[PDB]
Design a protein around this motif. Structure first.
Motif, PDB file in Angstrom:
ATOM      1  N   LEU A  13       1.942   2.671   6.466  1.00 17.48           N
ATOM      2  CA  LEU A  13       2.672   1.454   6.904  1.00 17.48           C
ATOM      3  C   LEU A  13       2.966   0.633   5.685  1.00 17.48           C
ATOM      4  O   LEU A  13       2.067   0.422   4.853  1.00 17.48           O
ATOM      5  CB  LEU A  13       1.862   0.511   7.812  1.00 17.48           C
ATOM      6  CG  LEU A  13       1.528   1.159   9.125  1.00 17.48           C
ATOM      7  CD1 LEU A  13       0.483   0.336   9.866  1.00 17.48           C
ATOM      8  CD2 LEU A  13       2.780   1.365   9.951  1.00 17.48           C
ATOM      9  N   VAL A  14       4.187   0.134   5.589  1.00 16.34           N
ATOM     10  CA  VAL A  14       4.586  -0.741   4.497  1.00 16.34           C
ATOM     11  C   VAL A  14       5.159  -2.020   5.107  1.00 16.34           C
ATOM     12  O   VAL A  14       5.953  -1.956   6.053  1.00 16.34           O
ATOM     13  CB  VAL A  14       5.646  -0.071   3.581  1.00 16.34           C
ATOM     14  CG1 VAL A  14       5.988  -0.990   2.428  1.00 16.34           C
ATOM     15  CG2 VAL A  14       5.101   1.270   3.055  1.00 16.34           C
ATOM     16  N   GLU A  15       4.752  -3.173   4.581  1.00 11.52           N
ATOM     17  CA  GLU A  15       5.251  -4.455   5.083  1.00 11.52           C
ATOM     18  C   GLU A  15       5.536  -5.334   3.871  1.00 11.52           C
ATOM     19  O   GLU A  15       4.614  -5.626   3.103  1.00 11.52           O
ATOM     20  CB  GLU A  15       4.234  -5.138   5.993  1.00 11.52           C
ATOM     21  CG  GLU A  15       3.772  -4.286   7.153  1.00 11.52           C
ATOM     22  CD  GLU A  15       4.762  -3.950   8.191  1.00 11.52           C
ATOM     23  OE1 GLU A  15       5.750  -4.530   8.321  1.00 11.52           O
ATOM     24  OE2 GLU A  15       4.366  -2.958   8.971  1.00 11.52           O
ATOM     25  N   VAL A  59      12.738   0.586  -3.967  1.00 10.22           N
ATOM     26  CA  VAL A  59      11.956   1.815  -3.855  1.00 10.22           C
ATOM     27  C   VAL A  59      10.622   1.716  -4.586  1.00 10.22           C
ATOM     28  O   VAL A  59       9.586   2.049  -4.023  1.00 10.22           O
ATOM     29  CB  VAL A  59      12.790   3.029  -4.339  1.00 10.22           C
ATOM     30  CG1 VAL A  59      11.915   4.275  -4.522  1.00 10.22           C
ATOM     31  CG2 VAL A  59      13.918   3.304  -3.367  1.00 10.22           C
ATOM     32  N   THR A  60      10.613   1.300  -5.853  1.00  8.43           N
ATOM     33  CA  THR A  60       9.345   1.317  -6.570  1.00  8.43           C
ATOM     34  C   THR A  60       8.334   0.343  -5.968  1.00  8.43           C
ATOM     35  O   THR A  60       7.127   0.567  -6.043  1.00  8.43           O
ATOM     36  CB  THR A  60       9.535   1.055  -8.079  1.00  8.43           C
ATOM     37  OG1 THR A  60      10.204  -0.188  -8.246  1.00  8.43           O
ATOM     38  CG2 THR A  60      10.314   2.191  -8.738  1.00  8.43           C
ATOM     39  N   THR A  61       8.820  -0.757  -5.385  1.00  8.91           N
ATOM     40  CA  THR A  61       7.931  -1.745  -4.784  1.00  8.91           C
ATOM     41  C   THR A  61       7.335  -1.210  -3.471  1.00  8.91           C
ATOM     42  O   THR A  61       6.126  -1.344  -3.214  1.00  8.91           O
ATOM     43  CB  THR A  61       8.698  -3.055  -4.549  1.00  8.91           C
ATOM     44  OG1 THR A  61       9.106  -3.604  -5.807  1.00  8.91           O
ATOM     45  CG2 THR A  61       7.821  -4.080  -3.871  1.00  8.91           C
ATOM     46  N   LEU A  62       8.202  -0.638  -2.634  1.00 11.09           N
ATOM     47  CA  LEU A  62       7.813  -0.109  -1.337  1.00 11.09           C
ATOM     48  C   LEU A  62       6.920   1.131  -1.466  1.00 11.09           C
ATOM     49  O   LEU A  62       5.949   1.290  -0.726  1.00 11.09           O
ATOM     50  CB  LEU A  62       9.067   0.239  -0.529  1.00 11.09           C
ATOM     51  CG  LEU A  62       9.959  -0.958  -0.134  1.00 11.09           C
ATOM     52  CD1 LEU A  62      11.304  -0.439   0.351  1.00 11.09           C
ATOM     53  CD2 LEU A  62       9.305  -1.842   0.932  1.00 11.09           C
ATOM     54  N   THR A 103       6.168  -8.900  -8.066  1.00 13.50           N
ATOM     55  CA  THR A 103       5.608  -8.402  -6.828  1.00 13.50           C
ATOM     56  C   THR A 103       4.098  -8.397  -6.896  1.00 13.50           C
ATOM     57  O   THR A 103       3.502  -8.118  -7.940  1.00 13.50           O
ATOM     58  CB  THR A 103       6.134  -6.984  -6.505  1.00 13.50           C
ATOM     59  OG1 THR A 103       5.712  -6.045  -7.493  1.00 13.50           O
ATOM     60  CG2 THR A 103       7.665  -6.959  -6.452  1.00 13.50           C
ATOM     61  N   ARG A 104       3.487  -8.687  -5.755  1.00 14.53           N
ATOM     62  CA  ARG A 104       2.041  -8.544  -5.599  1.00 14.53           C
ATOM     63  C   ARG A 104       1.828  -7.806  -4.285  1.00 14.53           C
ATOM     64  O   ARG A 104       2.364  -8.207  -3.249  1.00 14.53           O
ATOM     65  CB  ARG A 104       1.327  -9.891  -5.591  1.00 14.53           C
ATOM     66  CG  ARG A 104      -0.184  -9.756  -5.642  1.00 14.53           C
ATOM     67  CD  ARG A 104      -0.862 -11.100  -5.549  1.00 14.53           C
ATOM     68  NE  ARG A 104      -2.277 -11.036  -5.848  1.00 14.53           N
ATOM     69  CZ  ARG A 104      -3.209 -10.621  -5.017  1.00 14.53           C
ATOM     70  NH1 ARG A 104      -2.889 -10.199  -3.802  1.00 14.53           N
ATOM     71  NH2 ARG A 104      -4.469 -10.609  -5.451  1.00 14.53           N
ATOM     72  N   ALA A 105       1.043  -6.745  -4.343  1.00 13.57           N
ATOM     73  CA  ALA A 105       0.798  -5.916  -3.179  1.00 13.57           C
ATOM     74  C   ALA A 105      -0.680  -5.585  -3.095  1.00 13.57           C
ATOM     75  O   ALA A 105      -1.359  -5.487  -4.128  1.00 13.57           O
ATOM     76  CB  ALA A 105       1.623  -4.629  -3.243  1.00 13.57           C
ATOM     77  N   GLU A 106      -1.141  -5.368  -1.876  1.00 14.22           N
ATOM     78  CA  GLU A 106      -2.456  -4.804  -1.629  1.00 14.22           C
ATOM     79  C   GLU A 106      -2.266  -3.499  -0.884  1.00 14.22           C
ATOM     80  O   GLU A 106      -1.603  -3.462   0.169  1.00 14.22           O
ATOM     81  CB  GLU A 106      -3.354  -5.778  -0.875  1.00 14.22           C
ATOM     82  CG  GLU A 106      -3.609  -7.028  -1.752  1.00 14.22           C
ATOM     83  CD  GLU A 106      -4.649  -7.945  -1.249  1.00 14.22           C
ATOM     84  OE1 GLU A 106      -5.289  -7.611  -0.232  1.00 14.22           O
ATOM     85  OE2 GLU A 106      -4.849  -9.010  -1.889  1.00 14.22           O
ATOM     86  N   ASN A 116       0.493  -0.696   2.697  1.00  9.76           N
ATOM     87  CA  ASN A 116       0.987  -1.387   1.513  1.00  9.76           C
ATOM     88  C   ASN A 116       1.629  -2.699   1.969  1.00  9.76           C
ATOM     89  O   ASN A 116       2.705  -2.679   2.559  1.00  9.76           O
ATOM     90  CB  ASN A 116       2.023  -0.499   0.812  1.00  9.76           C
ATOM     91  CG  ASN A 116       2.556  -1.109  -0.455  1.00  9.76           C
ATOM     92  OD1 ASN A 116       1.958  -2.021  -1.026  1.00  9.76           O
ATOM     93  ND2 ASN A 116       3.705  -0.589  -0.935  1.00  9.76           N
ATOM     94  N   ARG A 117       0.941  -3.822   1.709  1.00  4.29           N
ATOM     95  CA  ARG A 117       1.432  -5.145   2.077  1.00  4.29           C
ATOM     96  C   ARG A 117       1.908  -5.841   0.801  1.00  4.29           C
ATOM     97  O   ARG A 117       1.141  -5.941  -0.153  1.00  4.29           O
ATOM     98  CB  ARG A 117       0.313  -5.997   2.692  1.00  4.29           C
ATOM     99  CG  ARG A 117      -0.099  -5.701   4.097  1.00  4.29           C
ATOM    100  CD  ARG A 117      -1.286  -6.639   4.381  1.00  4.29           C
ATOM    101  NE  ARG A 117      -1.913  -6.612   5.699  1.00  4.29           N
ATOM    102  CZ  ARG A 117      -2.959  -5.865   6.075  1.00  4.29           C
ATOM    103  NH1 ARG A 117      -3.556  -4.982   5.261  1.00  4.29           N
ATOM    104  NH2 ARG A 117      -3.386  -5.989   7.305  1.00  4.29           N
TER     105      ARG A 117
END
Ligand SMILES: [O+]
Length: 225
Positions: A13-15, A59-62, A103-106, A116-117
């Protein structure tokens, strides 16, 4: 130390919540990863405001835990080692002669599902540049993603270029600076210098009328014999 969590097919899941030059948008994604084969299959949907940037720029972020590490390189796989508690992935992406994304993701497990949030903030874009002007082709090149251990803390530093084809035949460069740190406080695998070899194919479902992107991606670690 979660390598074993990736031996099979794992739901993803990606958000994402984004704001680029004040244009707010969100993206949801679903699919699955099969790290044994370095393989990702996802479908993303734009869910709020009109997407203000081209899909390829996202793409690279997701979820680099789905890279295939050769057996002999397994001691270098930071990404899986941080699971299930996960890692923070932070970037600055400089689009040449245009703006930047921060970008900041967990990335972590929620039950069986790898999540991936992301929060994305873009500033300094040109109104009629390649990004805000939607001048990028709907395709994707193959890249090398360079990884090193962070010498000051328990993480990795990552750097790479992506090349986004422009509709006029030219190329929009994006320079990525990335850091990953564990969310938990347990040990992780700190790697020797190496890289990931990437390839991605973008498509559309002709029956999907929402703004969306279908992605098939293969990534293999390399550079250590
Ligand atoms: O979702």
């Amino acid at each position: 130390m979660g390598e074993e969590l990736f031996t099979g097919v794992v739901p993803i899941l990606v958000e994402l919540d984004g704001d680029v030059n004040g244009h707010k948008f969100s993206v949801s994604g679903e699919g699955e990863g099969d790290a044994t084969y370095g393989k990702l299959t996802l479908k993303f949907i734009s869910t709020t405001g009109k997407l203000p940037v081209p899909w390829p720029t996202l793409v690279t972020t997701l979820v680099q835990c789905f890279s295939r590490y050769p057996d002999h390189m397994k001691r270098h796989d930071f990404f899986k080692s941080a699971m299930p508690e996960g890692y923070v992935q932070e970037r600055t992406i400089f689009f040449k002669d245009d703006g930047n994304y921060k970008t900041r993701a967990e990335v972590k497990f929620e039950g069986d599902t790898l999540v991936n949030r992301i929060e994305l903030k873009g500033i300094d874009f040109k109104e009629d540049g390649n990004i805000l002007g939607h001048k990028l082709e709907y395709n994707y090149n193959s890249h090398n993603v360079y990884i090193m251990a962070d010498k000051q803390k328990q993480g990795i530093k990552v750097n790479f270029k992506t090349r986004h084809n422009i509709e006029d035949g030219s190329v929009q460069l994006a320079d990525h600076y990335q850091q990953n740190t564990p969310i938990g406080d347990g040990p992780v695998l700190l790697p020797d210098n190496h890289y990931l070899s990437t390839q991605s194919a973008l498509s559309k479902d002709p029956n999907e009328k929402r703004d969306h992107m279908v992605l098939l991606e293969f990534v293999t670690a390399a550079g250590i014999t």
